[PDB]
Amino acid sequence: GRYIGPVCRLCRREGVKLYLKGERCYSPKCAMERRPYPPGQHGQKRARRPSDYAVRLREKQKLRRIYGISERQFRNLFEEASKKKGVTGSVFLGLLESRLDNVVYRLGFAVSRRQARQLVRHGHITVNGRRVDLPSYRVRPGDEIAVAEKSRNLELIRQNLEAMKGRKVGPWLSLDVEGMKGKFLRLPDREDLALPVNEQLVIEFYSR
Amino acid sequence: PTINQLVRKGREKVRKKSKVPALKGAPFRRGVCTVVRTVTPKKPNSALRKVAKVRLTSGYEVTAYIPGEGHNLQEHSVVLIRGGRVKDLPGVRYHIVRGVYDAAGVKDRKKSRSKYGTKKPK
């Protein structure tokens, strides 16, 4: 299904913190900051010139990894963007961003991409009052997303949200704190996001 | 050729020849071993290369190859063949599929076991 397995090793192989694992990412004991080189035996050995296609490969993989998504679901979206009117690097990035599992993370109901999935899955989120437990759910603008009843009062969601007082969630959303709802406002601009990824090489990659 | 030449003589569409006619033209075919020897390959390869003549359900009688280290095949072993040519061995159009019918998988193989039909380790 999802990935499940060592997530750190990824961030070495890809060469950057795709923030993938909660509070730790921001420690001085996060994997990157300790040992920022590929997993494995030859992790330390001198690099060879990366092949043209190789470059495009990691890039596609850097992105996908960030959203912990199956390469099937991934490519399906990517095709949707092409058929869609607009900038494909861009619209890809947003069609990707409208993911319910993601929106929960973006609202900080959960600490991490990964975690967001489990919340959504055990129906802790609800879109527009009605409950939703598909993490693929495509959030439209003006969807009201929130924890609902029997978990609003839960050790975790409180903790993450307690910790959500004095931070500002990103420009394309909104957040009724401790009420525990947020609003998808509008689909993001490529430049609101500031992922370490070059949406263009991905496009390039699905060309060959 | 002038356009008039094209109207007159058309362009001739290509057409292709099967490298695999004995399969006739199924994805696999079953057969019965008539001979089971080793063959030497052409230069510059040197080996004692395992091979089996086969009589296919399709009618044809063809010769096929036994991939993997060691085989329990012998005459009248009934086996199925898949398309696949050996470059070294002239006239071996096909491959014999391990792990099917009278053909035991390679015993004790730990890698690429879906090729060579070996069931997974305890």
Partner: protein, 148 residues
Amino acid sequence: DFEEKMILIRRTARMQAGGRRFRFGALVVVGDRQGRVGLGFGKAPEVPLAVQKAGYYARRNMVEVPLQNGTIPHEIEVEFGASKIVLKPAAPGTGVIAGAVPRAILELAGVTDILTKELGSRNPINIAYATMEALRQLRTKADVERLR
């Protein structure tokens, strides 16, 4: 001070009595990614000598390349001997859709969204030059207009 990006290192052979003898060919493109490229092809006894050499020549040979919004301004086919390159402008969501050589030119010429197709003899060295003097023949609506 530009970027550069070797596209072809290759070895070749002479022949003296009692031995073949070697020489090396590097075919580097160099560019500022803003709209100035320049292809150079240098050769020398050792590899990196032949790569530095390539660099030098390269800069001594840059090119205009207009950039009507990250794409080129009009579709064009040039054909340096037997090899034919075909460039073609494209929408912004497109990316560089190109052979692995002509992309190294386009990339460093700052091109971002274009279509190519290599036709004819697909020798890199040729396809590279074919490409250079194919960019070289681009003109803007203005560029034209002044000509009539």
